[PDB]
Amino acid sequence: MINILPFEIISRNTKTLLITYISSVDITHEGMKKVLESLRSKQGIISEYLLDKLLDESLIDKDKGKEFLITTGVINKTKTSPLWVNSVIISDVPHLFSNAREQWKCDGVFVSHIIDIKDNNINVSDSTLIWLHLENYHSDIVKRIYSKFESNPGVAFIQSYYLKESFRIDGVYSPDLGTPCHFCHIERWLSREEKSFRRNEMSWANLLQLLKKYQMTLPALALGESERGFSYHLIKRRLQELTGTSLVKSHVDNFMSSVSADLITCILCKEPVIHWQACSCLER
Amino acid sequence: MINILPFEIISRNTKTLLITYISSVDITHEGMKKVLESLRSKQGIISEYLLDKLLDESLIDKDKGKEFLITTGVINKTKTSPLWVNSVIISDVPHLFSNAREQWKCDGVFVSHIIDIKDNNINVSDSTLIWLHLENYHSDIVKRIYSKFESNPGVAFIQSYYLKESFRIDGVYSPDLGTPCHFCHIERWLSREEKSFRRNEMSWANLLQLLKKYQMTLPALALGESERGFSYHLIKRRLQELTGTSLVKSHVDNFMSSVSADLITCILCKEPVIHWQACSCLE
Amino acid sequence: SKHELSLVEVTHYTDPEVLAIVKDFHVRGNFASLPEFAERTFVSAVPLAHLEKFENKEVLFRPGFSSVINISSSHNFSRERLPSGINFCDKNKLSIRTIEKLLVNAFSSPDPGSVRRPYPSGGALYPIEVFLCRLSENTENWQAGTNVYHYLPLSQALEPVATCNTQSLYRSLSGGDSERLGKPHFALVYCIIFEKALFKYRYRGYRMALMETGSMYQNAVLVADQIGLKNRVWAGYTDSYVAKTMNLDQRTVAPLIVQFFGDVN
Amino acid sequence: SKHELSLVEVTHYTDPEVLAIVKDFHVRGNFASLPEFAERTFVSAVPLAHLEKFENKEVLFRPGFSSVINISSSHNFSRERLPSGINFCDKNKLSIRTIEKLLVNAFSSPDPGSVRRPYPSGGALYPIEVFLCRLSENTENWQAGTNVYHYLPLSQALEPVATCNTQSLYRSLSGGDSERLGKPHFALVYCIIFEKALFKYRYRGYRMALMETGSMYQNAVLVADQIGLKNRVWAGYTDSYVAKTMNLDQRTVAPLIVQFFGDVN
């Protein structure tokens, strides 16, 4: 699979420059200039048949042309069959993603559907990554989604939501892989927020609360457009890491882990969470 | 009150040499020697009352004395109240900020105008922070803005632009406070490439110097809506950090820091900015 | 079974702060190592071209200096450890007898009435458990359809654990580097029971448990060499996926290390 | 020395967040174990009267159930590990020859031209260092006045480390339980170099390093039994005090475990 990487190709008078994340080149071949402009207008992935045709049209040797495009950082060739064949975004704010399916193709991210949480008969295919993004958090919403889709062969989930001044992206919940669920995450953060200087969340005060029906909303700051835009980019990049065009590789020890962003300072914290003792996600 | 800037005096026999961040001055009045000697050991803060007492005691006219101290860069007279009444954003993508002035009210950020860099005849009020935001970077665009507005009373500048996978926000450049400028960073960086013990023939300086020679801007690389929304919020929060600030309530490291954001990892890198002795902002 | 201890007794002494802090740390070293993540992740923080300068070296107490007391090799009466096996080949049948020989010699006294093992343990607590994973259909079996067992070193017996198929275990245990690994006959998986490692000695017990794991695989290395098996200790696996595949409860027990066994041809 | 690696090369790849988080955790398991702290501290969170029910037991995958595949003891071809030595007695002289025999067999190839060791290591990085501590004036010595050495497993040589006296090392290494310990001839101290354990594999490397420590002392256990030495792996020591006594820099290197050697009479 050929992935078109980020670059610009600019001209003024008789001068043309290519600039990528990897290199810059003073381009002196009209054929390759045309090729580069054509790749620049395409979104994300290109069929090797089309690349070859583009090269032929500009009278350029295919191996030399391809070698140039790869080594300079314009494209790359990936061989691996990925884990989730597809992503869906389920949300209480689907409008926020109304251009995301089209835009994010340029980052190599395939999102087949934006789904409003309000919909009855929400269906999802096998080996699909379900991103559940909530502005108005309620634990019943997450429970409903798990209840519907936990049994889907090859499924995984990411949950994103707001807590105090933070945007939270849970680690990847994959029943196949045995990783912690949303509830394992939110309990880690809710206990860390208690001002009782203890990692251990458990006391008789907590035990008596566990007698009641597990349910809750979360306090958070009001969102403006900038907070949403910031959140939108973090979602794109995270999906890109997992399923899209990889630009920077993640170490194997943090790849599936949670990502938290403070919306005031804009600082990110990547952290693996343990299975919460009182959660039964790993029993299912 | 009065900020006392860093300086040195070196004394040899009866001779004394004063060196500030912008001046080198032979000091041959005993009074001014004693005024300077005292300010040296005063640790940065001093009240109008104490300065006037110190001057009167050293037999130095208060007005001529203060003017000398301000002009040579021994002291500056920054406000107790916030340094910048309002802010303006000047940009080659002003349409990005079309709702920013309304939106950012509720964050306590007050931007009075969004301004297209392509406008002829840009005016900016006194005591106004100028945010220069550029998707297409060229150093003469900064040069132009600086020349137009450096002499506006109470003015300051901050610049944001794209360098490959990074979004960079420069430190705040304030002529009044004597903080570093855009070029204190970038020209110094270019200098280090040009004057490398062994030049890297594949230096990114080759690109930037060739864009100068060819009269081209450095484009931001393949920005989409998400990268711009991310940039928009960083701009909002930096402005928020610079709002309400003085030398009284705030601290000079809030101005003398840059923020760089990797647009891929979304990781921020806050770094100190320092003056470059060779920079024209020091003349 | 005659030597059974219930974890209910152990938990009576658990400090929940210790347990949480140890788990939080432990999970930092877990991997997401899958063939499907190969091109978007990495393992080595050192470039492969610079690795060779770090491998099989000596750090010195006095760098730059050469004053040493040399010891003679003539005192060495040992055989050289065999190179660790890689691209294992399972063309031959492997008997349960061979696997039994490994287990009893590595982890048990020759005296079945004894409760002493061929490796020591802090507090004689023995917090590390050994699981057997059957990975080839050319590996002989005890109970048809059962491919994960738990070795009871004192009873000298295998307890049935899981009837997952042979390809699922292999996929979980071999992570992203399975083509280079080839096809081993079986694996041992060494597992920490957190509360058993922590209840008596607190944090220091974790350290003791991880060290104990190394004493155990080492006995397996040495025994493996004497009975004609190749082996490789192996860290390239997705911890949680191995756990799930083996039906382990990650709240209680975690895989510290895998060790592959077989032939090389 | 021919195999020397400078730690300056290693630090080039260090993630300072990883290094800080690992040290912060590691120190949680350090002890303050001194005779003078005996009556105001404790070690075991379990009362001595209830310890016996936890020692030398089996935890089961299916508690309450007895269905197992029994394996025969006839496959065991090994000798029983000797009980760990306690109240060691140093009345006899112990030769450097005996100590050399231990070192080369436990930690080195019989081939002095080889760089392969009798225990494996993640990335072939070998982050654990072995120090020799001379603890009795009845122990023969190589360099008069020197009681701490560093064993170079590939060069097969001892590097002089410290000229502290024999009573200071003994006091540091034996913690609060020295009367029960008695008087050993010598000790090995196994030490993690944090940045060597972390630079390539990050957090997982710590886990690998601690496990490696266990592979090493295990070889020492087995070798010790064959050459007529008693031994005991030992965790009852004040980590920082051992480090200081050996002139180790705790920012770089820490003692994971001590192992005592001698006679029992």
Binding site: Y21, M32, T72 | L210 | - | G123
Partner: peptide
């Protein structure tokens, strides 16, 4: 570097090396 299509002006060598699971 050198090709018929243009002249390489600059390279991010750290990133190029990546374009400071054994042994080597």
């Amino acid at each position: 570097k050198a090709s018929e299509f243009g002249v390489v002006l600059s390279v991010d060598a750290l990133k190029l090396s990546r374009q400071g699971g054994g042994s080597h």
